[PDB]
From a paper:
Condensin protein complexes coordinate the formation of mitotic chromosomes and thereby ensure the successful segregation of replicated genomes. Here, we identify a direct DNA-binding site in the eukaryotic condensin complex, which is formed by its Ycg1Cnd3 HEAT-repeat and Brn1Cnd2 kleisin subunits. A peptide loop of the kleisin subunit encircles the bound DNA and, like a safety belt, prevents its dissociation. Firm closure of the kleisin loop around DNA is essential for the association of condensin complexes with chromosomes and their DNA-stimulated ATPase activity.
Whereas several basic residues of [name] and [name] directly contact the DNA phosphate backbone, several other residues are oriented toward the DNA but are too far away to make direct electrostatic interactions. As a result, the [name]–[name] groove might allow some degree of flexibility in accommodating the DNA double helix. This notion is further supported by a second crystal structure of [name]–[name] in complex with the same 18-bp DNA substrate, which crystallized with slightly different unit cell dimensions. Compared to the first DNA co-structure, the C-terminal [name] shoulder is slightly translocated, and as a consequence, the contacts between this part of [name]–[name] and DNA differ considerably from the other crystal form. The conformational flexibility in the contacts with DNA revealed by two [name]–[name]–DNA crystal forms and the low binding affinity to short linear DNA fragments suggest that the positively charged groove alone can only weakly interact with DNA duplexes. The facts that DNA contacts are made exclusively with the phosphate backbone and are conformationally adaptable provide the HEAT-repeat and kleisin subunits of condensin with the means to bind DNA independent of sequence or specific local structure, which contrasts sharply with the conventional concept of protein-DNA recognition (Rohs et al., 2010). Even in the co-crystal structures of Sc [name]–[name] with DNA, 43 residues of the linker that connects the α1 and α2 segments of [name] remained disordered. The trajectories of the visible residues that flank the linker, however, indicate that the path of the connecting peptide leads over the bound DNA helix.
Numbering used by the authors:
A (entry chain A): 7 to 188, 205 to 403, 410 to 498, 556 to 557, 567 to 911
B (entry chain B): 383 to 412, 457 to 524
Amino acid sequence: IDINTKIFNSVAEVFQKAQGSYAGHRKHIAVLKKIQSKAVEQGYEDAFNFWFDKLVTKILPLKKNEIIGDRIVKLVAAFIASLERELILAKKQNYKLTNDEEGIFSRFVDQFIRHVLRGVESPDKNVRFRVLQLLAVIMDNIGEIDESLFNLLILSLNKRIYDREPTVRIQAVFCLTKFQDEEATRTLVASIQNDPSAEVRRAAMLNLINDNNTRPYILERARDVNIVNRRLVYSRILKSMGRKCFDDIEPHIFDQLIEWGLEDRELSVRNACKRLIAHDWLNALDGDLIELLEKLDVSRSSVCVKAIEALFQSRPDILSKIKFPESIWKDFTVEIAFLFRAIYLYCLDNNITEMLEENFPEASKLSEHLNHYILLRYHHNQSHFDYNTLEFIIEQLSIAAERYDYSDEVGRRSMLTVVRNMLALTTLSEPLIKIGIRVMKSLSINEKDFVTMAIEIINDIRDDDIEKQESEEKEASSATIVLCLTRSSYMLELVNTPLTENILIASLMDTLITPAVRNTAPNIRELGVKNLGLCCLLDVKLAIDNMYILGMCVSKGNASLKYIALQVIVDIFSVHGNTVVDGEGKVDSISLHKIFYKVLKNNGLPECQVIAAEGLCKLFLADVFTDDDLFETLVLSYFSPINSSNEALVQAFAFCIPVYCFSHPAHQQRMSRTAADILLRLCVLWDDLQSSVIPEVDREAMLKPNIIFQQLLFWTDPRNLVNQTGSTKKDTVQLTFLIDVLKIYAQIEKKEIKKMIITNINAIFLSSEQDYSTLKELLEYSDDIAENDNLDNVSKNALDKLRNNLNSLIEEINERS
Amino acid sequence: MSIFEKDLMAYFDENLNRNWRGREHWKVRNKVLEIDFFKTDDSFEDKVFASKGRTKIDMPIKNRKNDTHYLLPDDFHFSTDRITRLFIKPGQKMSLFS
DNA sequence: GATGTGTAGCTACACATC
DNA sequence: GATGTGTAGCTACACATC
């Protein structure tokens, strides 16, 4: 036998048994190094390389997950690493080997890479996949390489990153993730943003360098459209950072991250974020709940309420460890003050009886601690930081005080004095004004009482300024007008009885409300309307006399003013309904509807569209509004391309429209009647959008008429009714709609649009329980177009299918009784 | 009014949780045993290294970039709760579905 | 594009072993 | 305690095939 032939027999023997299982791979590595060592002494070095390569080539055409290929891949990867290991630890302390070991390794790896690369651009997916796969698992162990071979690697990879297959695109990053130390990063930052394969982004996400420069793009995936890709940044990336989040992340992004995960739509992402906070971050800070709160900027963050609760549920044991001795109330900080709020409200909601008895001071005693901070804030002189610190503490304690057990008469009267003297303060910031009224509300146990006290705080603040104006002009300064109304709003937000019961408001109204409505300042005008809207919900006649002025404010008012005005009108209708329109001395509803249109149509102010959108849906749900033309104007604003840019408006309709139809048959019926003309108007819009040639063209800013059609089949489908009386199986709501669509089919011009409809007409639901005459009508219109028009073979088939389903249905009817 | 309004309200939240995006997302949404390393068929080897020819093995430049970055749009959490509450008087709520 | 089927990445519980 | 082990199921997501 020949030396060369003997080598092949030896190496081929290795792969034959290595493909069978992972059993004797340790041996095979030792054998291969032996075969190589035997060949180099006989001079046949290049013979070993040749047969090794040719034997690896046998597995490239194998699919992904083909169990055999993986085995060999792992074997080839182990053999290279094994050859480098011997080289590394040797270079460590052992003097250089006389047997030219590095050279053999350098020459073998270079030669091998160039071989596997010969199929880097093969027409076959599997070939290209397994070429990159081999390079990925062997990339770390290559060591030194020639420059030309280095340039050829980055080149072949930079072109494969944009390969057609995702599978091969993945492996393309792995090979790049190694060239990352700081062009490689540049590419991965581009793939993590623009690659349409979630798994290629994920690969570029987890394996990116995580440098100060690349950290933003990585965290960006927190809102990746893929469920997994979002769960990972919490479970994988933030864990890997441990405590580095609090040091090497800007808090403004930090707060945003925790806000998303907690409020995400997928249960799997919330937990993954919850578990990060409770388990990982608490163990990372040695169980110091305060330090954890020091990180989560408690003063500014709006999620501390969400984060803490998930923790209390994840660790009910630490719950009992809290500490609140009388000795403190000296070092009270935003963290401790907030802790007090977080704990106390949590015990009440979950009803932790043992704690509420002694873990919290009495009402009378809490008032002593609360007031203490009020005097220290307002009565006597990093100053602004201190001022904020006190306000936050005052707020937290106040929130806890709002839900106390006030059976204790001494504590109530004590607290009541603290808030009354606080609310009476002129420089009390709005956050504390709000809760103050909320507290004083919980102390009255009598609506009239709560009002009498509040009104007094207002009129006193009013008269104080007026009486000070007596120098040498019988009205309070502008600033005072703001304070009185700010308090009047929250106080009114809590009253739930007519104005006839409480006369003090009618005075207050003529005192400062209506003079504010007529004021020359925006903010005061906005406030006056808010308070006016709160009073209208109590007395109907007050609303009827104010319908005109309100509608006027909307029409001619600026963005801000028109914003608040339109809301009031919605609520007035919510409670009273149509008792405030269409009648003697009452405004005609037609005028208001025209005012809804102009806002809904208005695109210069998006936020106002949302209210007009949200507000009208609510009114249609309440069955107070019943105007087909208006309801039709709603759905148009959903699909319209002009409103596509208003992200808020789309989600508003996407949730209200489906529920509206499925709620009540009469609601769905209203869709069915006006569901045909809408499709027509939209077809025309898509036709004018696609055909028109303009620089500002976003032809993709609208659903194609085929999708829009399916949508209208969805809502009109009676099977989606929630009541399901059992007598709804015969509901002809969807048929009558399709009939109306067929009657319009003659009015569309483009063939493409016509097909877009016909291909989707069979989504309807047909039943033998439905009305016989209605199916016959639907058959004749389908029969009318089945032949009298020219059809694409696809359109005819679907249409013919429908007809025969009709005919097959009439067969199920008549033959009866 | 809360009794049954509560459940129907709870019905639509859980059912329409993933359709919040609206728009196109309205749709509910939703071998070889062994190799013989001894045989020689090396002309098969030339098959592997074949040039691309008319096979594309690449991604259209249209698909290589996307402006949305495949991110998720801002979420306004339009749930049954946000609908029942009034606008200027969030505490009180109206009893639609009645 | 509509399918059916496979796959990735969990997620949970019962457990041992030290 | 923690650390493994095995087993089970789940769901959004790929690819397969026509």
